[PDB]
Design a protein around this motif. Structure first.
Motif, mmCIF file in Angstrom:
data_model
loop_
_atom_site.group_PDB
_atom_site.id
_atom_site.type_symbol
_atom_site.label_atom_id
_atom_site.label_comp_id
_atom_site.label_asym_id
_atom_site.label_seq_id
_atom_site.Cartn_x
_atom_site.Cartn_y
_atom_site.Cartn_z
ATOM 1 N N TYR A 25 0.002 6.645 -0.429
ATOM 2 C CA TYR A 25 -0.400 6.133 -1.731
ATOM 3 C C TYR A 25 -0.568 4.621 -1.749
ATOM 4 O O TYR A 25 -0.825 4.051 -2.816
ATOM 5 C CB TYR A 25 0.594 6.579 -2.812
ATOM 6 C CG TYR A 25 0.571 8.075 -3.043
ATOM 7 C CD1 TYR A 25 -0.503 8.845 -2.606
ATOM 8 C CD2 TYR A 25 1.613 8.721 -3.704
ATOM 9 C CE1 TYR A 25 -0.536 10.217 -2.806
ATOM 10 C CE2 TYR A 25 1.584 10.096 -3.919
ATOM 11 C CZ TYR A 25 0.507 10.836 -3.465
ATOM 12 O OH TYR A 25 0.466 12.202 -3.662
ATOM 13 N N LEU A 26 -0.430 3.959 -0.604
ATOM 14 C CA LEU A 26 -0.858 2.571 -0.510
ATOM 15 C C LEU A 26 -2.366 2.474 -0.696
ATOM 16 O O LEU A 26 -3.112 3.406 -0.388
ATOM 17 C CB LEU A 26 -0.473 1.968 0.843
ATOM 18 C CG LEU A 26 0.941 1.397 0.957
ATOM 19 C CD1 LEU A 26 1.966 2.510 1.061
ATOM 20 C CD2 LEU A 26 1.041 0.452 2.129
ATOM 21 N N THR A 27 -2.812 1.348 -1.246
ATOM 22 C CA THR A 27 -4.239 1.095 -1.297
ATOM 23 C C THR A 27 -4.707 0.502 0.022
ATOM 24 O O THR A 27 -3.914 -0.017 0.819
ATOM 25 C CB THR A 27 -4.600 0.139 -2.431
ATOM 26 O OG1 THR A 27 -3.947 -1.120 -2.224
ATOM 27 C CG2 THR A 27 -4.176 0.721 -3.774
ATOM 28 N N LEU A 28 -6.022 0.587 0.246
ATOM 29 C CA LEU A 28 -6.620 -0.064 1.404
ATOM 30 C C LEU A 28 -6.343 -1.565 1.384
ATOM 31 O O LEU A 28 -6.079 -2.172 2.429
ATOM 32 C CB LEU A 28 -8.125 0.207 1.443
ATOM 33 C CG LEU A 28 -8.632 1.638 1.655
ATOM 34 C CD1 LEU A 28 -10.170 1.688 1.576
ATOM 35 C CD2 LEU A 28 -8.162 2.178 2.999
ATOM 36 N N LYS A 29 -6.391 -2.172 0.193
ATOM 37 C CA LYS A 29 -6.113 -3.598 0.055
ATOM 38 C C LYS A 29 -4.695 -3.941 0.503
ATOM 39 O O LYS A 29 -4.475 -4.960 1.170
ATOM 40 C CB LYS A 29 -6.338 -4.022 -1.396
ATOM 41 C CG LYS A 29 -6.010 -5.480 -1.697
ATOM 42 C CD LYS A 29 -6.921 -6.430 -0.937
ATOM 43 C CE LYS A 29 -6.732 -7.868 -1.406
ATOM 44 N NZ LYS A 29 -7.485 -8.837 -0.567
ATOM 45 N N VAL A 31 -2.878 -2.339 2.727
ATOM 46 C CA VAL A 31 -2.847 -2.239 4.182
ATOM 47 C C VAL A 31 -3.474 -3.474 4.813
ATOM 48 O O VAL A 31 -2.930 -4.052 5.766
ATOM 49 C CB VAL A 31 -3.555 -0.945 4.630
ATOM 50 C CG1 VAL A 31 -3.617 -0.854 6.148
ATOM 51 C CG2 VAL A 31 -2.853 0.269 4.035
ATOM 52 N N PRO A 136 -2.458 -4.359 -6.996
ATOM 53 C CA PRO A 136 -1.859 -3.287 -7.798
ATOM 54 C C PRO A 136 -1.568 -2.048 -6.962
ATOM 55 O O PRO A 136 -2.152 -1.820 -5.903
ATOM 56 C CB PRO A 136 -2.927 -2.999 -8.861
ATOM 57 C CG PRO A 136 -4.213 -3.378 -8.202
ATOM 58 C CD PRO A 136 -3.886 -4.560 -7.312
ATOM 59 N N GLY A 137 -0.632 -1.239 -7.465
ATOM 60 C CA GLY A 137 -0.226 -0.032 -6.788
ATOM 61 C C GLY A 137 -0.202 1.155 -7.736
ATOM 62 O O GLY A 137 -0.336 1.015 -8.956
#
Lengths: 241, 235
Positions: A25-29, A31, A136-137
């Motif tokens: 559920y991490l965003t690509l941003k 990572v 944001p997450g």
């Protein structure tokens, strides 16, 4: 004496919401940020030096950053917690001033019921020109809706989020019609909250423990909820028709 | 033994392709068909462009038409038709994803589809992928805390001019207002009758004219824009 033309680039600072805990559920941003920084700060308690969020961040791969831990005061005085916030802000400032990029990783969303906000506020107040970006997450209540396959809120229904339920709140708590109410910390007030819920009509309750963890428990049966052992990482929302 | 396809509902976030989750990308790269929502006006889907932006997606893209302001019979028939289209894909054993802006479970058309789909197919393998919300994104981009400590969060989907007189901003609350288009003047007048109030306003998050401000007079002077969002913090 004139200042001169010296240009020292301080490090760049990131606040990164990493979600409820599932590394998927991490965003690509998020990572990309973790792969682009020198230092990752994560939050620990005074009890153990274990950081769940450090494990989440390390699981994604390609992260060459050094990881450092920040302890935050879970005590009730505002001045002691403020001293801890000031000390952690100073630690971060020390790393930034040497030109190292840093990321502060926080569970959930970075701007929503987080300790990150106090850090960012103090940093920006002390260093007005500081380069800071917030990622944001995914929130825990959206995750609970997804995992339970229950709509959180739709059409003209209103959403309310209540952060810290206190035992002296169940009797005063209202559930207006056509609303969804998220209750974030149901740990040691769950008995009075359940008593309040069982005296309400036309309500559905979605309850979750340990979202994204091996022992992830989800139910919509109130009696099962009341039978459960009290869990710190628990969440519920109440839909009033 | 024919195994029907697996169904995914995928919130993709406010629109920036960097705000998709890893799970969302993996799902989009592993399904046969991606469905996205269009309006009755044009067959263009912003979320289709977003999903295609990530790369590696070999799926076929299909459009589903939704108009959620209409009468209950038109909405019900439209929901039944789109559910039948999805069923047509699933029954042939193809995995498909329903991509929606924002979070899949929060003010989305996806919930109506999932409800009817599960009613008609109780045994369907369905998984929902959560996404980043627009108000969390506005707080992130403005570097303003949405809500903290014991402050309460309220989200209001559709602001109406009559809410201005009836709306309360209790101290220590944050109120997200989702659609203030064509009622923004009365809302601003209501805001100007309060003290110790902060307003974070954003237009076109992730778009060329990405505009964010916290100055109430600047907000009142701007032309009204449909794709705008604000939250109101009362201390």
């Amino acid at each position: 004496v004139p200042r001169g033309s010296h240009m020292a680039s301080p490090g760049k600072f990131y606040g990164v919401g990493i979600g409820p805990g599932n590394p998927e559920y991490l965003t690509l941003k998020a990572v990309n940020v973790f792969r682009s920084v020198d230092v990752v700060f994560t939050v620990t308690g005074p009890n153990s030096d274990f950081s769940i969020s450090e494990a989440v961040v390390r699981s994604v791969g390609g992260v060459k950053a050094e990881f450092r831990k920040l302890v935050f005061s879970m005590s009730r005085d505002a001045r002691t917690r403020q001293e801890q916030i000031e000390k952690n802000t100073a630690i971060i400032e020390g790393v930034l001033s040497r030109g190292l990029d840093c990321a502060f990783a926080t569970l959930g969303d970075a701007m929503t019921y987080s300790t990150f906000g106090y850090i960012l506020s103090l940093l920006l107040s002390r260093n007005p020109g500081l380069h800071a970006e917030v990622v944001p997450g995914v929130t825990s209540f959206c995750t609970l809706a997804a995992r339970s396959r229950q709509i959180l809120v739709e059409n003209g229904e209103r959403l309310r989020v209540i952060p810290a339920f206190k035992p002296e709140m169940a009797d005063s708590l209202e559930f207006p019609p056509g609303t969804t109410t998220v209750l974030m910390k149901t740990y040691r007030s769950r008995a009075r909250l359940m008593e309040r819920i069982r005296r309400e009509k036309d309500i559905r309750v979605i309850y979750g423990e340990r979202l994204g963890m091996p022992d992830e428990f989800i139910t919509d049966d109130i009696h099962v909820i009341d039978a459960r052992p009290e869990e710190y990482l628990s969440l519920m929302f109440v839909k009033k028709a």
